[PDB]
A paper describes a structure:
Bone morphogenetic proteins (BMPs) and other members of the transforming growth factor-β (TGF-β) superfamily, like the activins, growth and differentiation factors (GDFs) and TGF-βs are secreted signaling proteins that regulate the development, maintenance and regeneration of tissues and organs. Members of the TGF-β superfamily bind two different types of serine/threonine-kinase receptors termed type I and type II receptors. In the present study we analyze the interaction of BMP-2 with its type I receptor BMPR-IA and its type II receptor ActR-IIB. ActR-II and ActR-IIB bind activin A (Act-A) with high affinity in the low nanomolar range leading to activation of the SMAD-2/-3 pathway, whereas binding of BMP-2 occurs with low-affinity in the micromolar range resulting in the activation of the SMAD-1/-5/-8 pathway.
The crystal structure of the ternary ligand-receptor complex of wildtype BMP-2 shows a dimeric ligand bound to only one BMPR-IAECD and ActR-IIBECD occupying the expected wrist (type I receptor binding site) and knuckle epitopes (type II receptor binding site). Both receptor ectodomains are located on the same half of the dimeric ligand, with the binding sites being almost identical to those identified in the crystal structures of the complexes BMP-2:BMPR-IA and BMP-7:ActR-II. The change in ligand-receptor stoichiometry in the crystal is clearly due to crystal packing as SDS-PAGE and RP-HPLC analyses proved this complex to be hexameric in solution. Inspection of the crystal lattice contacts shows that symmetry-related proteins block the empty epitopes. Inspection of the receptor-ligand interactions of both BMP-2/receptor complexes (comprising BMP-2 L100K/N102D, in the following termed ternary complex (1:2:2), or wildtype BMP-2, in the following termed ternary complex (1:1:1)) demonstrates that the ligand-receptor interfaces are highly similar. Superposition of the complexes yields an r.m.s. deviation of 0.3 Å for the Cα atoms of BMP-2 (in the ternary complex (1:1:1) only "bound" parts of BMP-2 were considered), and 0.4 Å for the Cα of BMP-2 and ActR-IIBECD. Analysis of the contact between ActR-IIBECD and wildtype BMP-2 indeed yields only five intermolecular polar bonds, one ion pair and four H-bonds. The H-bond between BMP-2 Ser88 Oγ and ActR-IIB Leu61 NH is in the center of the otherwise hydrophobic epitope, whereas the other polar bonds reside at the periphery. Comparing the affinities of the ActR-IIB variants L61P and L61A to wildtype BMP-2 shows no difference, indicating that, by contrast, in the wildtype environment the central H-bond does not contribute to the binding free energy. In the structure of the ternary complex (1:1:1) comprising wildtype BMP-2 the temperature factors of the equivalent residues Leu100 and Asn102 are higher than for nearby residues indicating increased flexibility.
Residue numbers in the entry:
A (entry chain D): 6 to 98
B (entry chain A): 11 to 114
C (entry chain B): 12 to 114
D (entry chain C): 34 to 117
The structure:
Amino acid sequence: AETRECIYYNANWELERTNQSGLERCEGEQDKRLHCYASWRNSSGTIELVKKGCWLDDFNCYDRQECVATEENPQVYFCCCEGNFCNERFTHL
Amino acid sequence: KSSCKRHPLYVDFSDVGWNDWIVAPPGYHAFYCHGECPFPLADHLNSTNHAIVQTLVNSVNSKIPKACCVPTELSAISMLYLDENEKVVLKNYQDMVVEGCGCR
Amino acid sequence: SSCKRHPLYVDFSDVGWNDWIVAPPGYHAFYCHGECPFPLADHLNSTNHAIVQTLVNSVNSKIPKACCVPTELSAISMLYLDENEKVVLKNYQDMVVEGCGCR
Amino acid sequence: PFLKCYCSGHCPDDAINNTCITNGHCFAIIEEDDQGETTLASGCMKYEGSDFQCKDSPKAQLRRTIECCRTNLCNQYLQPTLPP
């Protein structure tokens, strides 16, 4: 069974009673791909990290080693990828 | 017309009008189940003892409906969305994608 | 007219099982039938998929509504004749509809 | 089970006094069918999938407004109005 680990981050760790950052071991169903993701806000050029973690099999993340947002100008950016800790760094485009 | 099986279905959140609270994904392949559950119920058809009994009954009492083709195996997908307070939330929604169908 | 459990007594002599089954003579199997409308209430124990499909159907009628089927079934034991005239007791799962819902 | 709700049109078979028990939400909905005919209904909604159902789809072909609430018998106070 393929293993996957992602960077974990939660800006609302407090109100959610969770760690703020760390590592997350992903668990997937059989034959299902495993991904990581990052989400953040970009207000006034200042990047505000919202969440990072594991993400279930989703074709939008297939075979991407880099985590790149695929939405022009959203209020909340998102990217996902397929590789261990591939959400460590992220960019827009 | 056709036998009970999986059919394609892409749910596009913009078309449902949810692209404002769902940050990701833009949509997903949900699929659906459709098709007849004919007598005698085909082996390869995933069928419960009840569906079998009902199918037999329907063969001699048309007032009793046939079994129905529905999802018997499903998988989850992750979604990222904004709650009432514009706060970002992660949820792995279970049973969102039809993996296999059967007569029930 | 919405999804619910309906009566259905299965008489074994009516489906040709009485020559095989010594007891009981038949049993209450029930069946599920009815519309899966929006919204799907609690007692329909619907999956997220059925919920999403109902909403898509409401947007596009080309996509069928969810279907009313048994969401909980129970077992019943039955007595059969062994090739020795030996009455054998066997349990059969999923024979009786305990609850109906939209899937 | 923590929540009791009024139900009408959506009552389960074990409904007593037009109320139902759930662990999710109570809801009320107003709907306009093929004809300008309006009808009101209410009941219990399981927690699972309630975000989808309470939000509903603004692209539904028929006009309707569903509202949700989460305290005991609360849906008697929901008075949904059709969308413009």
